[PDB]
Motif scaffolding. Structure first.
Motif, PDB file in Angstrom:
ATOM      1  N   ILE A 118      -7.399 -55.679   6.851  1.00 29.58           N
ATOM      2  CA  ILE A 118      -8.292 -56.443   5.979  1.00 29.58           C
ATOM      3  C   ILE A 118      -9.753 -56.140   6.291  1.00 29.58           C
ATOM      4  CG2 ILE A 118      -8.898 -58.717   5.059  1.00 29.58           C
ATOM      5  CD1 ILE A 118      -6.061 -59.088   7.036  1.00 29.58           C
ATOM      6  N   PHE A 124      -4.568 -57.423  -0.839  1.00 30.64           N
ATOM      7  CA  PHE A 124      -5.913 -58.011  -0.803  1.00 30.64           C
ATOM      8  C   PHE A 124      -6.834 -57.255  -1.750  1.00 30.64           C
ATOM      9  CE2 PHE A 124      -4.055 -59.305   3.264  1.00 30.64           C
ATOM     10  CZ  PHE A 124      -4.337 -60.662   3.284  1.00 30.64           C
ATOM     11  N   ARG A 147     -13.456 -57.414   6.060  1.00 31.18           N
ATOM     12  CA  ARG A 147     -14.193 -58.651   5.967  1.00 31.18           C
ATOM     13  C   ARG A 147     -15.646 -58.356   5.592  1.00 31.18           C
ATOM     14  NH1 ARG A 147     -15.755 -62.536  10.975  1.00 31.18           N
ATOM     15  NH2 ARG A 147     -17.062 -63.920   9.688  1.00 31.18           N
ATOM     16  N   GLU A 169     -18.286 -62.997   3.791  1.00 34.52           N
ATOM     17  CA  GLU A 169     -17.022 -63.707   3.908  1.00 34.52           C
ATOM     18  C   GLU A 169     -16.949 -64.379   5.272  1.00 34.52           C
ATOM     19  OE1 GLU A 169     -13.359 -61.430   3.504  1.00 34.52           O
ATOM     20  OE2 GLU A 169     -12.380 -63.279   2.832  1.00 34.52           O
ATOM     21  N   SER A 222     -19.365 -54.876   7.803  1.00 36.53           N
ATOM     22  CA  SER A 222     -18.036 -55.097   7.217  1.00 36.53           C
ATOM     23  C   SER A 222     -16.939 -54.942   8.275  1.00 36.53           C
ATOM     24  CB  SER A 222     -17.784 -54.110   6.067  1.00 36.53           C
ATOM     25  OG  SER A 222     -16.432 -54.162   5.621  1.00 36.53           O
ATOM     26  N   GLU A 279     -15.314 -66.631   8.421  1.00 33.67           N
ATOM     27  CA  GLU A 279     -13.989 -66.684   9.061  1.00 33.67           C
ATOM     28  C   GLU A 279     -13.069 -67.641   8.304  1.00 33.67           C
ATOM     29  OE1 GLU A 279     -15.517 -67.668  12.983  1.00 33.67           O
ATOM     30  OE2 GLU A 279     -14.862 -65.734  13.791  1.00 33.67           O
ATOM     31  N   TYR A 338     -10.248 -56.134  10.304  1.00 37.30           N
ATOM     32  CA  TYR A 338      -9.290 -56.932  11.048  1.00 37.30           C
ATOM     33  C   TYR A 338      -7.876 -56.416  10.792  1.00 37.30           C
ATOM     34  CZ  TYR A 338     -12.859 -60.538  11.881  1.00 37.30           C
ATOM     35  OH  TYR A 338     -13.980 -61.227  12.276  1.00 37.30           O
ATOM     36  N   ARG A 382      -7.682 -66.657   2.679  1.00 40.82           N
ATOM     37  CA  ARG A 382      -7.002 -65.471   2.115  1.00 40.82           C
ATOM     38  C   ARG A 382      -5.698 -65.132   2.855  1.00 40.82           C
ATOM     39  NH1 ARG A 382      -9.886 -60.185   0.417  1.00 40.82           N
ATOM     40  NH2 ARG A 382     -10.770 -60.141   2.561  1.00 40.82           N
ATOM     41  N   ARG A 392     -13.177 -68.415   5.029  1.00 36.77           N
ATOM     42  CA  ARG A 392     -12.768 -67.785   3.761  1.00 36.77           C
ATOM     43  C   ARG A 392     -11.662 -66.766   3.992  1.00 36.77           C
ATOM     44  NH1 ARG A 392     -14.575 -67.303  -1.541  1.00 36.77           N
ATOM     45  NH2 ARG A 392     -16.231 -68.805  -0.996  1.00 36.77           N
ATOM     46  N   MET A 393     -11.863 -65.880   4.961  1.00 39.91           N
ATOM     47  CA  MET A 393     -10.828 -64.922   5.332  1.00 39.91           C
ATOM     48  C   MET A 393      -9.510 -65.612   5.688  1.00 39.91           C
ATOM     49  SD  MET A 393     -10.704 -61.737   8.086  1.00 39.91           S
ATOM     50  CE  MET A 393     -11.351 -60.840   6.515  1.00 39.91           C
ATOM     51  N   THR A 394      -9.586 -66.674   6.483  1.00 45.36           N
ATOM     52  CA  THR A 394      -8.398 -67.426   6.870  1.00 45.36           C
ATOM     53  C   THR A 394      -7.661 -68.015   5.669  1.00 45.36           C
ATOM     54  OG1 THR A 394      -9.299 -67.838   9.063  1.00 45.36           O
ATOM     55  CG2 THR A 394      -7.542 -69.341   8.285  1.00 45.36           C
TER      56      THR A 394
END
Ligand code: NA
Length: 179
Positions: free
Chosen positions: A28, A56, A30, A34, A4, A36, A7, A42, A38-40
């Motif tokens: 955040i 978040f 991650r 998830e 996990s 990169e 970031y 978000r 998907r995170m982006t």
């Protein structure tokens, strides 16, 4: 958990459509599942619907939480935000929990849109926009642990400046609107 990855997001936001000008930092988590990308998505949602009360959620790692949500001081949901390709059942049930539901969809949507869009007609205040794959891949690729973005929002277009330049994010609206 796990791995996990943690970031740090540093956002300078100049939203000319809403008159919002902020420098914000967010931590955040991650989840290993998830991507990169998907995170982006978000992070784009965070900038696009920024509020001091927006947080978040645990996203894909917890079925009972969204990717992002804004809650009242009484812990009630003002805004429920998902990313990706949730099904119509999930949108139906989540939308009942909030005054506003938004989805930033991504990936190939041809099969998904055909199933979901006809099924959510009667849902209240559900808003769905898609992020184009080309710019998403550019933004997301090899994301560093400290993500520094300058974001300008003008006439509905999101311009993100990162370490590789200024990238224009033009959302395709499937239903509803930014609000
Ligand atoms: Na990332």
């Amino acid at each position: 958990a796990q791995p996990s990855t943690t970031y740090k997001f540093e956002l300078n936001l100049t939203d000319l459509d809403r008159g919002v000008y902020e420098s914000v930092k967010q931590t955040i988590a991650r989840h290993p599942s998830e991507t990169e990308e998907r995170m982006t998505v978000r992070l784009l949602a965070y900038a696009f619907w920024y509020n001091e009360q927006l947080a978040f959620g645990r996203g894909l790692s917890d079925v009972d939480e969204p990717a992002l949500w804004e809650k009242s001081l009484d812990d009630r949901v003002l805004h429920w935000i998902e990313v990706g390709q949730p099904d119509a059942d999930r949108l139906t049930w989540c939308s009942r929990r909030t005054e506003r539901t938004s989805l930033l969809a991504y990936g190939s949507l041809r099969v998904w849109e055909g199933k979901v869009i006809p099924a959510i007609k009667n849902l209240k205040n559900v808003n769905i926009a898609a992020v184009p794959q080309d710019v998403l891949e550019v933004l997301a690729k090899d994301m560093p642990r400290v993500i520094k973005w300058d974001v300008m929002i003008s006439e509905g277009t999101v311009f993100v400046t990162d370490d590789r330049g200024q990238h224009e994010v033009q959302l395709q609206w499937l239903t509803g609107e930014r609000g």
